[PDB]
Design a protein around this ligand. Structure first.
Ligand SMILES: OC[C@H]1O[C@H](OC[C@H]2O[C@H](O[C@H]3[C@H](O)[C@@H](O)[C@@H](O[C@H]4[C@H](O)[C@@H](O)[C@H](O)O[C@@H]4CO)O[C@@H]3CO)[C@H](O)[C@@H](O)[C@@H]2O)[C@H](O)[C@@H](O)[C@@H]1O
Ligand SMILES: [Ca+2]
Ligand code: NA
Length: 765
């Protein structure tokens, strides 16, 4: 089922609305305002009877030189005897690098003015720095946290969101593997991203980490939570892992990814160095944000203004729409403001280029649209997308703090949402590889004919017609087959077919992987992959790896060799989408330029369509065919307008070079493979060609000269290193007797061939 939302007004919502009408504050100076001469503290809490500032030398009581300094009484901000809801004090002198908490004595929202008070110690709601484990805030000069050349670091923004290629990455996963070639100190840390010239096992043969990303050519890296989360003990062991969907401090970097979580400035500088390194690599940084819930209701929000910041049921229970125990009340004036101010902070202070909203379905449409407008004032190329669903039933008031009707930012309400707030298309996801809820379930690539309609509607970003949900335009659609949640693409292929064990190479499974690649990059919308999808990433069948072993979760960098051909295929498919404007369109101007051979809703083993282009200097027409049959199929296009074709992607390779020609309207499409072709006239005139070198790898029985296994194609930049390997799937009764050509070397302009010659063998042991 899809979870429900309910409009219910009660004592709590009416109390919160009254608080907004009187005390809503837009002053822009809540938290700490540092200067060398003085530091000013501001806390918003209309429910409070008193607020006390506590100063410490260190962020925890374990550290050397840790001591309580003193405590101070904050005073109400009055004008002509009228309180604006804000507490303030100004400390004269130099207070930088001191740590602090607030002691808030307060009622709840439904008992303001009463003697029913409780006192809570808490970090600042508007913390820009904390000590270890985010318990104590830190007074910092943010200038001191700027790395070398930070002033010259610019945003990396896509001209159009639909021109993106997103690599969804977890910071520990990136470099926790020793084979990553990243230094001992920086493995699984922010600073891993700053290490150039890293290679597999540091042997200097093939690129890893940042150099690998430059070669792959992804436009965008989306980072899993690097705001401060609860679920990793920052004073604990290095082997701890969590995705970090457990927020504690929204505007403070995560401590565990830094080299030193005790000094609050170090993580800020190192977090900025990561973002700079990615910007220097020409890559856009998208931040996974989780305003929909906090780890617990024992939070800075609840301790400051009890029952204001969370959606309250009539029974006094916290609404659990997140499935994590609570949901943030985005409809409230001061959380709306907090969220928007937070987004602007990460953009301006950390140079973040966009956001992925966790459970965007829990966040109200008005708030989301206002956030889009705010970020537009900085730059409208700043990207926004999110999950158009919740994680449970959500109880909200009828209206927002503005007096407009509450609407959740779900798939169902895509029409009410800005067309530049994109939504994850679970339609094409389930269409391609099968239900995400069931690892054993088949989609189109595994041979489901019923799944074809999922793919076919996905091809135009679910923006043409209606199947499941409808995007306003391709700009409002994220096109993907897998993410960090549920099974990896290759794990679902393995589980659903039983072709092999998890993480084991299988020729037919890899064919299916290549086909998924073809679909993603011949589909409209914002193309998105899990980091390592291109190298057949496995989690050993883990369908919820959020707190699983770090070595299970980590990117196995050996896969860039083991699946170098698959990486090469993705690398080439990315080039195709980038070269052909209809695929990267933001609007619906190309919707009526598609000619599907069969009905879009057809149950078929072969999907085919043509796309008419209108951009001068590009290809005039593209033909796309997906064949999920176990045999080769002759597919005849219904569109006969073009009868001279150049093939640019097949079962073997993909890219901008001609792989052969086709006369007429009929194409022979190999089993479990795609064909991408373009009009010959256009291919000649456009002058679009590859600058990448090729290596063909053959596997031959020496005695007969016959192939034991299909040849594969590696592709990469001329001068970049490659490593070929003997085929993993060849029976154990054959052994490599001899190698022809350069098994290892650098790509050249001319294609090189490597042949692994095999002889008769009996394992024995
Ligand atoms: O008080 C209740 C409860 O609170 C704490 O546990 C919270 C929560 O922890 C687990 O949920 C996990 C999921 O299993 C993960 O898949 C992940 O979900 C996120 C997903 O990956 C994102 O894509 C999406 O945007 O956001 C979701 C989360 O909203 O992360 C969550 C949170 O870590 C567990 O499965 C839940 O049952 C549980 O409620 C606390 O640790 C518990 O002791 C406590 O009982
Ligand atoms: Ca933390
Ligand atoms: Na283009």
């Amino acid at each position: 089922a899809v979870s429900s939302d309910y409009a219910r007004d009660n004592s709590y919502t009416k109390a919160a609305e009254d608080i907004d009408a009187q005390y809503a504050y837009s002053g822009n100076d809540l938290g700490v305002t540092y200067t060398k001469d003085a530091t000013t503290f501001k806390v918003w809490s209309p429910t409070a009877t008193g607020v006390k500032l506590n100063i410490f030398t260190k962020g925890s009581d374990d550290e050397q030189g840790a001591s309580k300094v003193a405590s101070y009484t904050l005073e109400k901000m009055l004008v002509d005897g009228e309180w604006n809801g804000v507490w303030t004090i100004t400390l004269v002198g130099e207070w930088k690098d001191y740590y602090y908490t607030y002691s808030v004595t307060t009622t709840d929202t439904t008992h303001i003015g009463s003697d029913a008070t409780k006192t809570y110690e808490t970090q600042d709601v508007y913390s820009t720095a904390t000590g270890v484990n985010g318990k104590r805030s830190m007074i910092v000069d943010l200038d001191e946290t700027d790395p070398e050349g930070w002033s010259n670091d610019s945003h990396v923004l896509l001209d159009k969101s639909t021109k993106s290629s997103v690599w969804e990455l977890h910071i520990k996963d990136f470099s926790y593997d020793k084979a990553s070639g990243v230094s001992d100190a920086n493995r699984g840390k922010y600073l891993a991203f700053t290490e150039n010239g890293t290679t597999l096992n540091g042997e200097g043969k093939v690129s890893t980490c940042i150099d690998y990303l430059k070669e792959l050519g992804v436009t965008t890296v989306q980072l899993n939570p690097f705001y401060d989360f609860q679920s990793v003990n920052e004073a604990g062991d290095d082997s701890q892992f969590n995705w970090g969907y457990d927020p504690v401090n929204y505007n403070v970097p995560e401590g565990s990814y830094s080299s030193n979580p005790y000094d609050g400035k170090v993580r800020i500088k190192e977090c900025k160095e990561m973002i700079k390194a990615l910007h220097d690599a020409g890559i856009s940084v998208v931040m996974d944000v989780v305003y929909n819930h906090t780890y617990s209701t024992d939070s800075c929000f609840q301790y400051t203004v009890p029952n204001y910041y969370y959606r309250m049921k009539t029974t006094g229970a916290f609404s659990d729409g997140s499935g994590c125990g609570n949901e943030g009340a985005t409809e409230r004036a001061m959380y709306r403001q907090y969220v928007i101010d937070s987004l602007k902070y990460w953009v301006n202070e950390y140079h973040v280029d966009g956001f992925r909203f966790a459970l965007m379905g829990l966040m109200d449409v008005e708030t989301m649209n206002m956030a889009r407008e705010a970020l537009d004032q900085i730059d409208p190329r700043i990207t926004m997308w999110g999950e158009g669903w919740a994680g449970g039933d959500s109880y909200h008031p009828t209206n927002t703090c503005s007096g407009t009707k509450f609407y959740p930012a779900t798939q169902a309400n895509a029409s009410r949402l800005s067309d530049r707030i994109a939504i994850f298309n679970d339609g094409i996801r389930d269409g391609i590889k099968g239900s995400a809820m069931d690892i054993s379930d088949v989609g189109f690539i595994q041979g489901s004919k019923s799944s074809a309609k999922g793919v076919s509607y996905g091809v135009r970003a679910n923006s043409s017609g209606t199947y499941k949900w409808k995007a306003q335009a391709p700009s409002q659609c994220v096109t993907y087959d897998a993410c960090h949640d549920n099974a990896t693409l290759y794990d679902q292929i393995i589980a659903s077919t039983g072709l092999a064990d998890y993480g084991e190479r299988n020729s037919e499974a890899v064919k299916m992987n290549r086909l998924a690649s073809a679909i993603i990059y011949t589909s409209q919308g914002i193309s998105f992959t899990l980091a390592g999808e291109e190298m057949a990433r496995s989690k050993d069948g883990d369908t919820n790896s959020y707190k699983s072993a770090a070595n299970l979760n980590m990117i196995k960098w050996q896969n860039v060799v083991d699946y170098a051909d698959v990486v090469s295929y993705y690398k080439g498919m990315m080039q195709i989408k980038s070269a052909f404007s209809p695929l990267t369109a933001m609007d619906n101007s190309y919707a009526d330029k598609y000619t599907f051979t069969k009905k879009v809703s057809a149950s078929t083993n072969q999907i085919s369509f043509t796309i008419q282009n209108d951009v001068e200097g590009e290809w005039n027409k593209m033909a796309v065919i997906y064949n999920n049959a176990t045999t080769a199929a002759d597919v005849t296009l219904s569109d006969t307008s073009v009868t001279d074709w150049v093939v640019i992607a097949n079962g073997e390779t993909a890219g901008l070079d001609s792989l052969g020609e086709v006369t007429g309207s009929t194409f022979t499409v190999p089993a479990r493979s795609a064909i991408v072709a373009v009009d010959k006239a256009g291919y000649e005139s456009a002058g679009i060609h590859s600058s990448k070198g090729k290596v063909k790898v053959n596997y031959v029985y020496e005695a007969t000269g016959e192939k034991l296994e299909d040849s594969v194609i590696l592709q990469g930049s001329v001068g970049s290193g490659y490593v070929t390997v003997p085929s993993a799937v060849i029976p154990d009764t054959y052994i490599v007797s001899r190698i022809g050509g350069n098994a290892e070397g650098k790509y050249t302009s001319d294609m090189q061939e490597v042949t692994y010659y095999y002889t008769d063998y009996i394992p024995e042991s």
